[PDB]
């Protein structure tokens, strides 16, 4: 099984079974990627 | 008076340890994944 194919695949990856019982499985986190980057060096 | 529940609390691995640090996030796992065990115990805290 792939560990990042589908959420079920990752749950199998973490609890380490293909016969996984019924329950809430926190796997990992997520933080939304930076939609944009702004840089302003101090501004004759 | 009886305190019955702590605050369920969790830590992100990279976001805490490295956040934006790509070098830290990369070098974290090669040094181990302690945060995983930290976190199962924390999740157990919460769920128990």
Curated annotation (Swiss-Prot), chain A:
Disulphide bridges, residue numbers: 3-13
Residues modified by carbohydrate are: 35, 37, 43
Disordered: annotated span: 31-43
The organism sits in which domain of life? Viruses
Q: What does the record note on quaternary structure?
A: Binds to host ACE2. RBD also interacts with the N-linked glycan on 'Asn-90' of ACE2. Cleavage of S generates a polybasic C-terminal sequence on S1 that binds to host Neuropilin-1 (NRP1) and Neuropilin-2 (NRP2) receptors. Interacts with host integrin alpha-5/beta-1 (ITGA5:ITGB1) and with ACE2 in complex with integrin alpha-5/beta-1 (ITGA5:ITGB1). May interact via cytoplasmic c-terminus with M protein. May interact (via N-terminus) with host bilirubin and biliverdin, thereby preventing antibody binding to the SARS-CoV-2 spike NTD via an allosteric mechanism.
| Record's function text | Attaches the virion to the cell membrane by interacting with host receptor, initiating the infection. The major receptor is host ACE2. When S2/S2' has been cleaved, binding to the receptor triggers direct fusion at the cell membrane. When S2/S2' has not been cleaved, binding to the receptor results in internalization of the virus by endocytosis using host TFRC and GRM2 and leading to fusion of the virion membrane with the host endosomal membrane. Alternatively, may use NRP1/NRP2 and integrin as entry receptors.
Its protein name is Spike protein S1
Organism of this sequence: Severe acute respiratory syndrome coronavirus 2 (2019-nCoV)
Higher taxonomy: Viruses, Riboviria, Orthornavirae, Pisuviricota, Pisoniviricetes
The residues of the intact protein that this chain contains are 289 to 337 of 1273
Curated annotation (Swiss-Prot), chain B:
Q: Which domain of life is it from?
A: Viruses
Q: List the disulfide bonds.
A: 13-35, 18-24
Role, per record: Precursor of the fusion protein processed in the biosynthesis of the S protein and the formation of virus particle. Mediates fusion of the virion and cellular membranes by functioning as a class I viral fusion protein. Contains two viral fusion peptides that are unmasked after cleavage. The S2/S2' cleavage occurs during virus entry at the cell membrane by host TMPRSS2 or during endocytosis by host CSTL.
The protein in question is named Spike protein S2
